[PDB]
Amino acid sequence: MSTRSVSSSSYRRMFGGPGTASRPSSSRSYVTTSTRTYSLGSALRPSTSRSL
């Protein structure tokens, strides 16, 4: 017989389906500004009382 040899390409592995590796968890970011506590002159300003 001329041997019908086993043509042995990568039917064994290199597959496949879970090619979904690094899904972007970066879709969860947490951006926030340098959050201000605001200044107020209300404790710099006393009551200048006029005595008559």
Next chain:
Amino acid sequence: MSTRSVSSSSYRRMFGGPGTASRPSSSRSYVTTSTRTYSLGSALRPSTSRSL
């Protein structure tokens, strides 16, 4: 007895498929960083009545 059956082994080398040069999946599957900075916008104007 022979035959004319095709005799493909692996026959064109043996090394897998063309086929995965391991393109590096960077860890952008982490969470994008918390940009938690803070502005001390109030104490930087020390608003106190020295009129006492």
